C-alpha cells in the first residue's frame, strides 16, 4: 500500500527572489525528467516540512570550517556513496556513525587538533550519470530520490513522489544521528574501546598497536589531570550530500532571521553540500544556486581542472573572502595527484582566499574487476592521500581533510587492506547501490595510516 | 484532482521469542478505543514500522527515568505541556518552534520559583490520536479520532479509518522530533534568550505589573550567576523530552525495541516517545493499555479523574511499579477545581501508605472543560489556576511533594480558553479557535499560569 | 625579665643599574612622616628584606590590574576593607579569619546587589604604620606610629623608633598572607557557607526584619544556580588581595622586585602587597610617595579629602596614570557626609574630562570621625551610610560609575563606632574599644552597611 | 642586629590533654638540649602564630592519599635534605617547586593517574645525629631549627630562639609556594615546556625524546578534544618535614572544629610529617605523638625492619583502618631491597590495612668519596626504585610512590646521571647542608626512568 500526504492550499525579499530565479533559469545538468506540475506539487509539500537542519547549526559549522581553513582543525567527511530507502535502518545508521567516530578519534590524536565530523547522510539519495542507458540497456538508476535500483524498466521511471520520500527518510535518519551523538554512542572512551577491539583482531593489528596504546595513554592522561569529561561524552556530526536535484534543494530553502546581519537563504536539507564533476559548469545552475545559499559548499576538482578555472570557482563562491566558506575537493587518482595538484594550489593560494583543501582519494581510483564488480584498490586510495600530503608539505599549505565513502558494515567492495580482500571475495557482500565503499575495518585502517601522515 | 501525493511503501530480526510470547499474552487483553481497520493492513504497516529509525533511544529514556526519580523524591519538578492533538497540517517549523518556546518560558519561571530543576516534557512527536465518546458526531459523521486514524475534515471519505496513517504519523513524529533536538541544542533553549522573551511579555501583558517583581528577581538571579563567574555551557541548551498518550496499540507495539544490554540487561522500550501515559477511557485495570504499560521500561503515567477510588489507584501502583522504582509511575489528577480538595487527599494517603514513590502531577485543564453560549468547547483560566492551587494545598497538608503539572498550551496567540490577563470573552473565542480537539491555553496564558504557579511553589 | 625573644638576623643580584638610577632620583624627593632611626641600621634591615620571599608575586598583580580595569569600565565593583591598624599582638589566626570572613560576607551581598563581580581587597599583611599630626601625645610621650615603627604601649622605651620592626613586620605580613591564601582556597570562602553566616545574622540582628527580603532573594538566586545545574568550582573559593597604605619608604623600597619578563617586559613591582595607596598626609605632588607610586607597576590609590581641588586631582592622574591604563589609578574620596555632595562633582567632572579612566572609590569612615563625651575617638554609623549615599547620588547625576568602597571593619564584636541596628551608645564604647588607631565597624555593622549599599546599587 | 618578639601574657578537651601529656612524657630521642624555661617561652609564642597549614587542607590530603593507598594515584615527595635560613629565598624556593612539578608531569603521564605532590619544605630545618661529636670534633649540626652549620663551637650551641626563626622562615616560604602554584608557575603547558628544553640539551636527551614527544601529543590531544583548561593552570603542593623537634611540633598543634565528627588535634606546621629511623622507637614519644595527631604520617623503614615490627606500626598508627593514614617508607639500599621488602609487604598486606608503600631510594645508598664528600650514586638510586617496583609487581601490590631529595639548582652532590658527575666534579657546587641531593637534571632524569618503570 501507500501513505498519502495532503498538498497544502511572507514573500522573499525582492533581491533574493530575483537572484534565486536567475540562478534556477540557468542550464542544469543531470536533472530528472518528470512532469513540472507533479514536481511543483511535491515542492509545495517540502516547502512546508520541518527542516533537516537549522541556520544556527550551519553558522556554527562555518566557524569550525574556518578553523580548518586556517590550519587549526581538520575535516573528516564520510559515509555511503548512495544511501537507500531500504537500508535507512537503525543498525545501518548507527554503524556508519560509529565508523566515522572511530576514524575521528584516531585522526584527532594524530593531527593534534580538532576534527570536524561531517557525515554523508540524510540526503545523498541521488547521483549523476555519464550514460542515460546502463550496461543492461535500462534507464540508469540515479538514486532513490529519482528512481529504483531494481533492474527493470518500470522501477527506473523517474518518480517525483520520491522527493518527499527522500525528505522523510532524511529527517528520520537525522533524528537518529542527533539522538545517538548526544546520548552515549559518541562517548570518547566508548569509541576508543572499539578501536582497541579492532587492533586486537585485525590481521595487521600489530602494525597499529603502538598508536592505539599511545592514544589510550593520552586519554588516561586527561583523566589523571582531572579534566572535566563533559566534552568527552558527546560529539557533533554534521550532515552533507551532493546538491544534485534542484527541485529538492530549492524546496528546502528557508530564509534565516536578521538575528545575524541581513536575512539570507539557507538550504536546510543539510549543513553543507557539494557540487560534483558533472554539474560544476561555471555558468550552470548548480554553481549559481551555491552562490545564493549561505551554507558552506564544496566543489569536486578532477584531472582536467586548470588553475585558472579553480580561481574562478573561488571568486564566484567565496566572493566576500570568508575562510571555510569554500572547500575544494581534489580527486585526481594516485598516479596523478602529485603532478596535477600543485599548480592548482599555488594559484589559489596566490588569490589571498582561504579555502579548505580536501582529498577525495576514492573517485579518481575506481576500476572494474575481472569478476564484474566496480571496485577500488585500498593501496591506491592510501597512496592518493599520501601524495596529497606531500603536495601540501612542499608548498607549506594545510592538508585540510579527507572525503571518503565508508560503511560500518563488513562489506567486500574495495580490494586489499589488512583483510586482503581479493577479486573472488567481492561476490560475498557487494551491497553498495553505486560505488564501492571501504569496510569498517578498512575505513579504520586508513585513519591509522593518515594519522601517521599527519604525524610526520 | 485529489490534492494528495501517494508515497509508496516497500515490503532486521524479530523481537526474541520469550519477549514476543509475553507481549502476545498481554495484547490478548481487550483494548478499548481502537481503530476499526483491516487486520491484514494493520500488520503490513506494523511491519514497516518495525524496521524504521526510532524516534527516541533507550539511553535517553534511562536518563529521563533518573531525572523523574528526583522528581518523585521531592528534588525536581515536572512540567509537561503542548497541544491537545497535534495535526499533520500544522506540524510545521513555526508551530513546533512556538510550542517548544512556550514550554521553555514556563520552565525558566518554574525553575526559579521551585528552586530546583524542571524536567521538561513536551506533548509532541506522536500525539496524533484521541478516544471518542460518540459513535456519531453532531454532523452525523463517524467521529474524528486524530490524524493517526482518520481526517479532521467533515466528510465521510476522510473519516474512514486509514492504516496508512500509522506511517504518516511516524514520519511526522520523526521530523518534528528532529527539529525539537536541533532547536534545543542550537540556541532556542539558551536561558538568557528565553528569559528576554519573558521580559517582553512582562512589559506588554495587561497584568505585566503584577508579575514585574518576580521577573526582575529572576533577572537578578541570572545576573548573579554571571557575576559569580559560573555562567557555564549549561545555560545554553536544555533537554525537552517527548510524550503522548499511548492509545493506538498497533503504533505503540510496532515501535517497541530491545535495548542492547551494554548498560544493564536487555529490556523492552517503546521508542515512539520517551514517556507515555494512559487516558481515562483506556485505563481498565485488566485491559491491554495497562498491560502494555507494565511490559515496557519507559516511565509511564495514568490519568485519574473524579471516579477514582484509593483502592483502584493502589492497584495501578502495584501493577505498574512492581519493582518499586521511584518515578517509574506518575499519577495525574484531573478532578476539576471544585472537587480536587475533597477527592485527592484520600487517594494520596492510600498510595503513600503502600511505600511506593509515585510522582503526583496535576492536570488542571481536563476536569474543567465546558461549552460556551457561542458554541465552543472551552475552559476558564481561573478554574485552571484554582485546581493547581488546590492540588498544592492538598500536598502541603499531607507533607507530600506536589510533583508537577500537565497542561495543554501553544505558542500561538489563539483564543480557546476564556480569561487570563487578556480577558478573553465568549465572543473573542470565534477569532482564533484553532484546536483540533480541546481548548489550549495560548502563549500569554501559559506564561501567566507559570508565574502563578511559581508563587504557589514559593509559599 | 624583658618578656621578649631576640631573633638573630644574618647579614641575589641588586636591581639593575638603570632602574636603580631612576629609583634614586625619585627617592631623593622629600618624604613626609618617615621614621627617625639611624640610616645605617635602616640599610641593614633593607638588605635583609631585599632577599626574603615576597608576600605577593607579579602575575597576581597583573591579574588584579585586569580585574580593576573592569571596575574602572563600570563592569565590576571594588570592596576594600579591614583594620585601621593591624598590630603584631592581634595578628592571630582568629582575628585574621574573622576579618576575612567579614569581608566575604559583605562581598556576597554586594555581588548580588551590584549584579556584577566584586574585587575583594583586604587591608592586611603590611598595614602596620601610620602618620601623625602631634609631635607629642596626650600622655607627653612620642607618638605611636604603628608596629612597623614603634610600640603602642605608653612608655618611652617602647616608643623609640626601632628599625628591627621592618623585619618583624615582614614576618607578620608573610604569615598572615600565608593564612589568607590557605583559608580562601580551602573552604572559608565557599559561597554557600558565607551566605549561611549572613542568614544567621539576619535571624539574629535587631533589624533582621529590614534585611530579610534581600537575604531571601539572595538565597533563591543561589538555589537557582544549583537548579540550573551550573554550581561549579567557582562557588567554592574566592580571591582576596592584600593592600596597605605605602607609608614607610624603607619597607616599600626593600620589597621591590623585577618581574622576570616571561609575560611582557621586565618591570618593577612592590611585592609587599598587591595594591597600595597614599594617604592625605603623604600625597605631596612633588614628594617621594607619589614618585614611588609612579615608578612601581602595582595599581595604586590616592586619598582625596575636603581640600582637594579638581586641578590637583588632574595632576595625580597625569603623574600616576600617564599611559592611560584603566584601573591603574583609584581616587578615594573622604570628604564627610555633609560635604560629599558639594565637593565631589567638580572633581569628577574635571578628571573625566582628561579622558583617563580612574576608579572612583568612596571612603566613608575617615571624613566622619569625632570625639565622644566619654573620651573615645568615634564615628557614627548613619554618617558613614550617608556619605556612601551621597557618593552614589553624585555619580548617578554625572552618569559615572560609583566604583567601590574602602572601609575599616573587623570580624570581632567591638564597640568602636556608634549606631547601627545594635544601637551602640556613648557608654557602650567603653566595653570593647580595641582599635590601635581609628574606630572600626564591627562585624554586624559592616554587614548591615553592605545591605544598605546593595540597596543603593539596585536603585 | 636582631628583631625581637613579645611573649604573650579555651582548654583542650580532657582526653586530648591526657593523651597528649602521656605521649610527651615518653622517651624522646634526638632532642635538642636547651633550657626548659627558654623552650617554654618560645612555645608560648608559637602557640599564638598563624599556622602554616589549615585542617581542611589536611583532610583533603588525606582523601587524596587514600586514592594512593587504593592503587589509584601515586605519591611524589621531594625537596631539600635540609632547608637553611640562608637559602630560603625566592629563587631557591621557585626552583625546588619547579623541579618537583617537572617530575610530576612525567610521572603523571607514565602512571596514567594523579600524582600527589608533596614537597619537603617549610619545615625540614632539623635532623638527627648518630654522633653528638662530628668528624671535626664539634658538637654536631642538627639543622637550623637547633643550631648553625658554620664549623665553630659558638655557632653549634643549641639556641631555642631558632624555633621561632624556623616558623618565620616556614611561613614565608609556604606563602610563596601557595602564590606560585596558584599563579602560573604550575601551569601544565609551561612546566612541560621546561621538560622539552631539558630533553633538547641533556646529553642523554635522545634517550628521553620519545617519551617527551608522547607527552606533548597527549597534551595537544586534550586541547584538540576541547577539554576545559582550568584544571591545567594550577596544581596543589603540600608541605612535609620530619617531625623531629617536639618542642616545635607541640607548639604548632591546633584543635579543629567539630565541622567533621569530633574535635581533633592537627599539627599545623605541615600537611604531613614522617618519623625517621632514629626516632621511631615503638614506645617512644615520636610514635605516640604521631598517634595523637590527625595528620597523615609516614614511618621510615630501613634494613633491620622485621615484618612483625612493621605490623605493630600499622596497628598503632592506623588503628581505625583509614586508607592513606599511614605511609611506610622503604629505604633498604639497592643491593638489599629485593630480599628485605617482600616479607614486610606480605605481612602488612595480610593485616587488611591499606598503607602506602613508598620508596626512599636515597638514604640507603649514601657513601663517602675519595675526595671527602658524602655522596650517592645515581645508578644505585635508580636501581633501588627498580627493585622496589619488582617487589610490588611480584606480589600484585601497589608501588605507591617515591620520596627523594632534590633541588632545582645545578649542584654537584650525587655522582652519575647523564651529566656523568665524577668525584672531581663534586668540589664545584657541593652546597647541601646535610645529604647530597639530585640535581635538577638528575631529578628529571629519574622521573623519566620511573615513568618507564610505571609503563612496563
Ligand atoms: N569534544 C568532542 C570529543 C569527542 C567525543 N567523542 C569523540 C569521538 C571521536 C572524536 C572526538 C570525540 C569532539 O572532539 O568532537
Ligand atoms: N541546564 C538547563 C538550564 C536552562 C537552559 N535553558 C533553559 C530554559 C528554561 C529552563 C532552564 C533552562 C536546565 O535547567 O535544563
Ligand atoms: N567566584 C567567586 C564566587 C564566590 C565564592 N565565594 C564568595 C564569597 C563572596 C562573594 C563571592 C564569592 C567570586 O565571585 O569571587
Ligand atoms: N590538576 C593538576 C594538573 C597539573 C597542572 N600543573 C601540573 C604540573 C605537573 C603535573 C600535573 C599538573 C594536577 O594534576 O595537579
Ligand atoms: N525505509 C523507509 C521507511 C520510512 C517510511 C516513512 C518515513 C521514513 C522511513 C522507506 O521505505 O521509505
Ligand atoms: N504536514 C506533513 C508534512 C510531512 C510530509 C512528510 C513527512 C513529514 C511531514 C504532512 O502533511 O504529512
Ligand atoms: N604576634 C606575632 C607573632 C609572630 C612571630 C614571628 C613571626 C610571625 C608572627 C609577633 O608578636 O610578632
Ligand atoms: N633568611 C631569613 C630571612 C627572614 C627573616 C624573617 C622572617 C623570614 C625570613 C632568615 O635569615 O631568617
Ligand atoms: Mn561515490
Ligand atoms: Mn486534551
Ligand atoms: Mn583609619
Ligand atoms: Mn636526608
DSSP collapsed to 3 states, A376-422:
EEHHHHHHHHHHHHHHHHHHCCCCCEEEEEECCCCCCCCEECCCCEC
The total number of structural domains in chain C stands at 1
3-class SS at A114?
coil
DSSP B233: G
Nearest Cα to Cα of residue D76 among D235, D279, D197, D294: D235
Q: Give the position of cell 617621594.
A: C288
DSSP D256: P
∠ Cα B93 B96 B97 (to 5°):
80
Is residue D410 included in any domain, yes or no? yes
Task: For strands B275-278 and B241-245, give the pairing.
Answer: parallel
User: Considering only CA atoms, which residue is closest to atom 2 of ligand 1?
Assistant: A235
Residues ≥6 apart with Cβ < 8 Å to B142: B135, B136, B150, B156, B159, B160
Mutation choice for ligand 1 from A98, A104, A444, CB with most ligand atoms inside 8 A: A104
Is residue D25 included in any domain, yes or no? no
The answer, for D231 touching chain A at a CB cutoff of 8 Å, is yes
Is residue C321 included in any domain, yes or no? yes
Ligand 6 within 6 A of CB of B87:
no
**Residues 93-112 of chain A whose Cβ lies under 8 A from any Cβ of chain B:** 93
The answer, for D17 touching chain A at a CB cutoff of 8 Å, is no
Is residue B227 included in any domain, yes or no? no
Q: Give the position of cell 603590611.
A: C126
For the record, the C-alpha cell of A181 comes out as 551523538
Query: Rounded to an integer, what distance in angstroms lies between the CA atom of residue D244 and that of residue C148?
Result: 34
Q: Which residues surround ligand 10, an ion (CB under 5 A)?
A: B 84, 438
Q: Which residues of A touch B41 (CB under 8 A)?
A: 1
- Residues making up chain C, counted from first to last: 459
Ligand 12 centroid to residue D389 C-alpha, Å: 22
3-class SS at C256?
strand
Q: Render the burial of B282-305: b for 16+ CB within 10 Å, e for the rest.
A: bbeeeebbbbbbebbbbbbbbbbb
Give C16→chain B minimum CA distance, Å: 40
The answer, for B234 touching chain C at a CB cutoff of 8 Å, is yes
Of C7, C167, C178, the CB nearest to D161: C7
Ligand 9 centroid to residue A249 C-alpha, Å: 19
Q: Which residues surround ligand 9, an ion (CB under 5 A)?
A: A 81, 435
Check CB contact under 8 Å for A224 and D114. Answer: yes
Query: Rounded to an integer, what distance in angstroms lies between the CA atom of residue B375 and that of residue A253?
Result: 41
Question: Which residue in chain B is spatially nearest to C222 when comparing CA positions?
Answer: B221
For the record, the C-alpha cell of C259 comes out as 618581574
Nearest Cα to Cα of residue D269 among D235, D297, D230: D297
Mutation choice for ligand 3 from B225, B228, B229, B232, CB with most ligand atoms inside 8 A: B228
Note whether B415 and B346 are within 8 A (CB): no
Interhelix angle A440-455/A188-201, rounded to 10 degrees, is 100
Ligand 1 within 6 A of CB of A434:
no
Ligand 6 within 6 A of CB of A6:
yes
3-class SS at A250?
helix
Note whether D334 and D365 are within 8 A (CB): yes
Question: Which ligand ends up closest to the CA of A82?
Answer: 9
Atom number, ligand 4, closest to the C-alpha of residue D186: 6
3-class SS at B115?
coil
Of A4, A48, A86, the CB nearest to B5: A4
Check CB contact under 8 Å for D227 and A224. Answer: no
Question: Which residue in chain B is spatially nearest to A2 when comparing CA positions?
Answer: B8
CA C18 to chain centroid: 32
Q: Which residues of C touch D54 (CB under 8 A)?
A: 179, 182-183, 186
Query: Rounded to an integer, what distance in angstroms lies between the CA atom of residue A190 and that of residue A178?
Result: 17
Ligand 4 centroid to residue D448 C-alpha, Å: 17
Nearest Cα to Cα of residue A117 among A253, A282, A238, A256: A238
Residues ≥6 apart with Cβ < 8 Å to B23: B15, B253, B256, B268, B295
Is residue B7 included in any domain, yes or no? no
Q: Which helix (H) or strand (E) holds D375?
A: strand D374-376
Ligand 5 within 6 A of CB of A88:
yes
Number of H helices, E strands in chain C: 13, 13
Ligand 3 within 6 A of CB of C117:
yes
For the record, the C-alpha cell of B406 comes out as 500537565
Q: Give the position of cell 557618593.
A: C391
Atom number, ligand 1, closest to the C-alpha of residue A186: 6
The answer, for C224 touching chain B at a CB cutoff of 8 Å, is yes
DSSP B321: -
* Neighbouring C-beta atoms of residue C168, cutoff 10 Å: 21
Is residue A402 included in any domain, yes or no? yes
Note whether D181 and D188 are within 8 A (CB): no
The answer, for C92 touching chain B at a CB cutoff of 8 Å, is no
3-class SS at D367?
strand
Query: Rounded to an integer, what distance in angstroms lies between the CA atom of residue C31 and that of residue A186?
Result: 68
The structure was resolved experimentally with X-ray
User: What are the residue ranges of helices labelled H in A270-306?
Assistant: 285-292
Check CB contact under 8 Å for B230 and C231. Answer: yes
Ligand 4 centroid to residue D110 C-alpha, Å: 13
* Neighbouring C-beta atoms of residue A201, cutoff 10 Å: 9
The answer, for B52 touching chain A at a CB cutoff of 8 Å, is yes
Ligand 1 centroid to residue C40 C-alpha, Å: 67
Query: Rounded to an integer, what distance in angstroms lies between the CA atom of residue B39 and that of residue B352?
Result: 43
Question: Which residue in chain B is spatially nearest to A238 when comparing CA positions?
Answer: B182
3-class SS at D267?
strand
Ligand 12 centroid to residue B391 C-alpha, Å: 73
Q: What are phi and psi of C80, to 5 degrees?
A: -130, 130
Note whether A52 and A268 are within 8 A (CB): yes
Note whether A377 and A416 are within 8 A (CB): yes
Q: Give the N- to C-terminal CA distance of chain B in Å, as an integer.
A: 61
Check CB contact under 8 Å for A109 and D221. Answer: yes
Range of the domain at A434: 50-181+236-456
Note whether C457 and C405 are within 8 A (CB): no
For the record, the C-alpha cell of A185 comes out as 554512542
For the record, the C-alpha cell of D105 comes out as 608531569
Task: For strands A115-120 and A74-79, give the pairing.
Answer: parallel
Note whether B129 and B148 are within 8 A (CB): yes
Q: Which residues of D touch A109 (CB under 8 A)?
A: 217, 221, 224
Q: Which residues of D touch A219 (CB under 8 A)?
A: 221
Q: Which helix (H) or strand (E) holds D306?
A: none
Atom number, ligand 1, closest to the C-alpha of residue A108: 10
This structure's resolution (angstroms)?
2.4
3-class SS at D71?
coil
Using CA atoms, how far residue B322 sits from B279, B295, B346, in Å, is: 20, 11, 22
Q: Cα torsion for C416, C417, C419, C421, to the nearest 10°?
A: -70
- Residues making up chain A, counted from first to last: 456
Is residue A316 included in any domain, yes or no? yes
DSSP C142: B
Is residue B459 included in any domain, yes or no? yes
User: Considering only CA atoms, which residue is closest to atom 9 of ligand 8?
Assistant: D169
Amino acid at each position: 500500500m501507500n501513505w498519502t500526504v495532503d498538498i497544502p492550499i511572507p514573500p522573499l525579499p525582492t533581491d533574493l527572489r530575483t537572484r534565486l530565479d536567475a540562478a534556477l533559469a540557468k542550464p542544469a545538468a543531470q536533472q530528472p525528467t518528470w512532469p513540472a506540475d507533479q514536481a511543483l506539487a511535491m515542492r509545495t509539500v517540502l516547502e512546508s516540512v520541518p527542516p533537516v537542519t537549522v541556520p544556527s547549526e550551519i553558522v556554527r559549522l562555518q566557524e569550525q570550517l574556518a578553523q580548518v581553513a586556517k590550519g587549526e582543525a581538520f575535516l573528516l567527511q564520510g559515509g555511503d556513496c548512495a544511501e537507500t530507502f531500504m537500508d535507512n535502518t537503525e543498525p545501518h545508521i548507527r554503524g556508519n556513525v560509529r565508523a566515522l567516530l572511530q576514524m575521528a578519534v584516531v585522526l584527532t590524536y594524530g593531527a593534534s587538533m580538532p576534527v570536524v565530523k561531517v557525515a554523508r547522510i540524510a540526503g545523498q539519495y541521488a547521483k549523476p550519470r555519464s550514460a542515460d542507458i546502463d550496461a543492461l540497456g535500462l534507464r540508469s538508476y540515479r538514486g532513490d530520490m529519482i528512481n529504483g535500483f531494481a533492474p527493470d524498466a518500470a522501477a527506473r521511471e523517474h518518480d517525483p513522489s520520491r522527493l518527499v520520500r527522500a525528505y522523510a527518510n532524511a529527517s528520520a535518519a537525522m533524528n537518529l544521528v542527533r539522538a545517538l551523538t548526544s546520548s552515549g554512542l559518541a562517548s570518547l572512551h566508548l569509541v576508543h574501546d572499539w578501536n582497541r577491539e579492532f587492533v586486537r583482531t585485525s590481521p595487521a593489528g600489530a602494525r597499529y598497536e603502538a598508536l592505539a596504546t599511545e592514544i589510550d595513554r593520552g586519554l588516561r592522561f586527561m583523566s589523571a589531570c582531572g579534566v572535566a569529561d563533559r566534552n568527552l561524552q558527546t560529539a557533533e556530526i554534521y550532515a552533507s550530500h551532493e546538491a544534485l536535484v534542484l527541485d529538492y534543494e530549492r524546496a528546502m530553502l528557508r530564509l534565516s532571521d536578521g538575528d545575524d546581519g541581513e536575512p539570507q537563504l539557507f538550504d536546510l536539507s543539510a549543513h553543507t553540500v557539494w557540487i560534483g564533476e558533472r554539474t560544476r559548469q561555471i555558468d550552470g545552475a548548480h554553481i549559481a544556486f551555491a552562490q545564493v545559499i549561505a551554507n558552506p559548499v564544496g566543489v569536486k576538482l578532477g584531472p582536467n581542472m586548470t588553475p585558472e578555472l579553480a580561481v574562478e570557482y573561488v571568486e564566484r563562491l567565496d566572493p566576500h573572502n570568508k575562510p571555510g566558506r569554500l572547500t575544494l575537493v581534489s580527486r585526481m587518482g594516485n598516479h596523478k595527484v602529485r603532478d596535477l595538484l600543485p599548480p592548482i594550489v599555488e594559484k589559489v593560494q596566490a588569490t589571498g582566499h582561504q579555502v579548505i583543501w580536501q582529498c577525495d582519494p576514492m573517485h579518481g581510483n575506481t576500476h572494474e574487476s575481472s569478476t564484474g564488480f566496480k571496485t577500488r584498490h585500498f593501496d591506491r586510495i592510501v597512496d592518493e592521500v599520501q601524495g596529497f600530503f606531500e603536495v601540501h608539505r612542499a608548498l607549506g599549505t594545510h592538508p585540510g581533510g579527507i572525503h571518503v565513502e565508508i560503511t560500518g558494515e563488513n562489506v567486500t567492495e574495495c580490494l586489499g587492506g589488512a583483510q586482503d580482500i581479493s577479486e573472488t571475495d567481492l561476490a560475498g557482500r557487494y551491497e553498495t547501490a553505486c560505488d564501492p565503499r571501504l569496510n569498517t575495518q578498512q575505513s579504520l585502517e586508513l585513519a591509522f595510516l593518515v594519522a601517521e601522515m599527519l604525524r610526520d
